[PDB]
Design an enzyme around this catalytic site. Structure first.
Site, short mmCIF file in Angstrom:
data_model
loop_
_atom_site.label_atom_id
_atom_site.label_comp_id
_atom_site.label_asym_id
_atom_site.label_seq_id
_atom_site.Cartn_x
_atom_site.Cartn_y
_atom_site.Cartn_z
N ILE A 151 0.82 -1.20 0.00
CA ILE A 151 0.00 0.00 0.00
C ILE A 151 0.86 1.25 0.00
O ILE A 151 0.68 2.14 -0.84
CB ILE A 151 -0.96 -0.03 1.20
CG1 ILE A 151 -2.00 -1.12 0.96
CG2 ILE A 151 -1.59 1.33 1.44
CD1 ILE A 151 -3.02 -1.23 2.01
N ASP A 170 11.14 1.62 6.75
CA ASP A 170 10.79 0.23 6.93
C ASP A 170 12.07 -0.45 7.39
O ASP A 170 13.13 -0.27 6.75
CB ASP A 170 10.28 -0.37 5.63
CG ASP A 170 9.51 -1.63 5.83
OD1 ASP A 170 9.91 -2.44 6.66
OD2 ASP A 170 8.51 -1.83 5.12
N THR A 202 1.90 0.70 8.56
CA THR A 202 2.29 -0.22 9.62
C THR A 202 1.15 -1.10 10.13
O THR A 202 0.04 -0.59 10.36
CB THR A 202 2.80 0.62 10.79
OG1 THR A 202 4.08 1.18 10.48
CG2 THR A 202 2.92 -0.19 11.97
N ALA A 230 -4.38 2.90 8.55
CA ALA A 230 -3.79 1.57 8.69
C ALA A 230 -4.58 0.82 9.75
O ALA A 230 -5.68 0.34 9.48
CB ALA A 230 -2.33 1.64 9.09
N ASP A 255 -8.66 7.10 9.55
CA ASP A 255 -9.59 6.09 9.11
C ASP A 255 -9.79 4.98 10.12
O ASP A 255 -10.84 4.33 10.09
CB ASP A 255 -9.16 5.46 7.79
CG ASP A 255 -10.24 4.61 7.20
OD1 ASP A 255 -11.32 5.18 6.94
OD2 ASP A 255 -10.04 3.38 7.03
N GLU A 260 -12.92 0.33 17.76
CA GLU A 260 -13.33 0.54 16.36
C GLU A 260 -14.55 1.43 16.13
O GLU A 260 -14.39 2.45 15.46
CB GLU A 260 -13.50 -0.80 15.63
CG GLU A 260 -13.30 -0.60 14.10
CD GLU A 260 -14.07 -1.57 13.22
OE1 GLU A 260 -15.26 -1.32 12.91
OE2 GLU A 260 -13.47 -2.57 12.78
N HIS A 278 -13.69 3.26 8.58
CA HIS A 278 -12.93 2.08 8.12
C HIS A 278 -13.32 1.69 6.70
O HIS A 278 -13.47 0.51 6.36
CB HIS A 278 -13.13 0.92 9.08
CG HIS A 278 -12.09 -0.15 8.97
ND1 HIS A 278 -12.01 -1.00 7.89
CD2 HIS A 278 -11.11 -0.52 9.82
CE1 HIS A 278 -11.02 -1.86 8.08
NE2 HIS A 278 -10.45 -1.58 9.24
N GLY A 280 -11.37 1.82 4.47
CA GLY A 280 -10.09 1.49 3.86
C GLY A 280 -10.18 0.50 2.71
O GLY A 280 -9.54 0.67 1.68
N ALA A 281 -11.01 -0.53 2.86
CA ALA A 281 -11.11 -1.57 1.83
C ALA A 281 -12.46 -1.52 1.14
O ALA A 281 -12.85 -2.48 0.47
CB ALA A 281 -10.88 -2.96 2.43
#
Ligand SMILES: COC(=O)C[C@](O)(CCCC(C)(C)O)C(=O)O[C@@H]1C(OC)=C[C@]23CCCN2CCc2cc4c(cc2[C@H]13)OCO4
Ligand SMILES: COC(=O)C[C@](O)(CCCC(C)(C)O)C(=O)O[C@@H]1C(OC)=C[C@]23CCCN2CCc2cc4c(cc2[C@H]13)OCO4
Lengths: 302, 302
Positions: A151, A170, A202, A230, A255, A260, A278, A280-281
């Site tokens: 990503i 990283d 991360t 993330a 995000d 949660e 969330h 994200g996906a």
């Protein structure tokens, strides 16, 4: 042929390709505690989204079994000491969401840059304030990227095009390979004072639980803006809220959250903070391809 | 000519470069409508941007002034016919905003895609609406940029990084030079049915006043998503207001308006509409980066 559960929201392409090997599942999860005695008692597998926080007991209550796997990101709902009872593994789909979280975060960089949601949220409140929402340009401001997998390298190739200087860290990833996707690499010590933005991708890890804490924020120079799409937590939510409160953080885009559905409500209510559940996906696209990749790396071993 | 006023909010960025090319000037702004003829019956130049627009007649009652100048794209504040034929013509700032409006537009594309403001306003209302904002990917979707040039070509290269096939149409701009930033060119006839998104920054013209109307909408895809960070009018606000209604345009992002502060409020309120009060050009990177050029094309007259 054993047949399983659609224990969550997933694009029906998932079930059709899931079966044209011989293996379907029931169209629901609307539930929570006491109707999920139904999907118990049988099955070998399970295919979720994650709203199916499988309790300490409901993976041991389907002792007809060997493996389970979910189309998407990690598993934020499985106690896997309480998951891997007999011969368990959980298959995930770490490649499918790769492109669309990158899209989400670059959108969040741009909003962090300008304050696009704040401006329309009170335009919709009926106000023409051409004076409060004066943003900053991206080209030439300095972006820092912690971790550098799928990503992040896609975030970076997408964002060096806006004219942004991309540095990061990283541990495993060579300085040579970072350079060979245009992100400079550093020890964190220097990554803080050099940055106008900080994003992370991360995974949640002890090395990284709260890897942006009061020290890192003490080292970034003033008004930096942090993005987190993330895992919830990698930015110390209290420490982040503090830097926000006084001048160290011009704005922040979040995000994910430690809790949660965050019942802590200080960050999202803050003027300089932009939000999302969330997502994200969350594309008809991404769920398409992770449902496929789960339902093929599932339907073709054993 | 060596006496000037900036009738507007001004980063002294302008005035400092103004001074030792040979020109002194005073620091006011707050101003009435018919009172800066006192401040400007005894000085000769002027620099405005937005506030208290240079009238048609504040060329006839200020019997001194002879050249003018605006920090921004275009001039949305000068009656240019009542300028030209008394022998006054206008230097403006065509270069400073290209990059920060290009960036804003790419941000608005991303928000239309993934509904970042729409998601944040209900985070701030404390609702975790994780399925209402299931957005779209940019990668693979097909973008349209009507009119190319500064902003259009920079939006095009910025948005090619996301994997978008980006086409457009500028009559003047060469088909061969069309390519030099990866936008194919076609006439509108075919560019409509081809588009998941469309951006505009085309100037206001009867050639283009309401260049997106109920006709254009009858040919492009459906659920198409347009951004307009140009001039108010190039998209028919009534025609667009209806297009939203039918799903024919799934979402839309508007930085500018036909009115000014629009007493029309139908579009701004729509759940699938996102806004901002003419923030296209508002970073002092860009804004003072215009302060340089206006007061150099002044000091490249004396
Ligand atoms: C701190 O150590 C690291 O960052 C290395 C690592 O981030 C993690 C190793 C890979 C796994 C996920 C298997 O642990 C990585 O290589 O990518 C992960 C990886 O596999 C490549 C999956 C992840 C985790 C969340 C986002 N995503 C896809 C790729 C990616 C991109 C990033 C990022 C993390 C990820 C991970 O931060 C910088 O930009
Ligand atoms: C309808 O036909 C056109 O679109 C041609 C024209 O948009 C305007 C012609 C150039 C001039 C202004 C000299 O007539 C153009 O070439 O660019 C203008 C141009 O010169 C390149 C100046 C402009 C005007 C407002 C914004 N800006 C920067 C460049 C740009 C980028 C665009 C755009 C307009 C502009 C103009 O539509 C979407 O992408």
């Amino acid at each position: 042929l054993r047949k399983v559960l659609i224990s969550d929201s997933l694009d029906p392409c998932c079930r059709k390709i899931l079966q044209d090997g011989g293996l379907q599942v029931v169209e629901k999860q609307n539930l929570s505690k006491e109707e999920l005695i139904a999907e118990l008692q049988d099955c070998e597998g399970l295919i979720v989204r994650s709203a199916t926080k499988v309790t300490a007991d409901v993976i041991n209550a389907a002792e007809k079994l060997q493996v389970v796997g979910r189309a998407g990101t990690g598993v934020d709902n499985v106690d896997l000491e309480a998951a891997t009872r007999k011969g368990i593994l959980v298959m995930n789909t770490p490649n499918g969401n790769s492109l669309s979280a990158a899209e989400l975060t670059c959108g969040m960089i741009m909003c962090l840059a300008r304050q696009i949601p704040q401006a329309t949220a009170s335009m919709k409140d009926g106000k023409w304030e051409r004076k409060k929402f004066m943003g900053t340009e991206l080209n030439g401001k300095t972006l820092g990227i912690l971790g550098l997998g799928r990503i992040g390298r896609e975030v970076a190739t997408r964002m060096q095009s806006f004219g942004m200087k991309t540095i990061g860290y990283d541990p495993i990833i060579s300085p040579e390979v970072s350079a060979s996707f245009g992100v400079q690499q550093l020890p964190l010590e220097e990554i803080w004072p050099l940055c106008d933005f900080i994003t992370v991708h991360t995974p949640l890890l002890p090395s990284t639980t709260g890897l942006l804490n009061d020290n890192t924020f003490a080292q970034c120079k003033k008004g930096v803006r942090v993005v987190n799409c993330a895992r919830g937590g990698i930015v110390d939510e209290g420490a982040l809220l503090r830097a926000l409160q006084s001048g160290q953080c011009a704005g922040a885009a979040l995000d994910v959250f430690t809790e949660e559905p965050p019942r802590d409500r200080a960050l999202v209510d803050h003027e300089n903070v932009i939000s999302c559940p969330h997502l994200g996906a969350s594309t008809k696209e991404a769920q398409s391809r992770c449902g496929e990749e789960i339902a093929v790396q599932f339907v073709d071993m054993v």
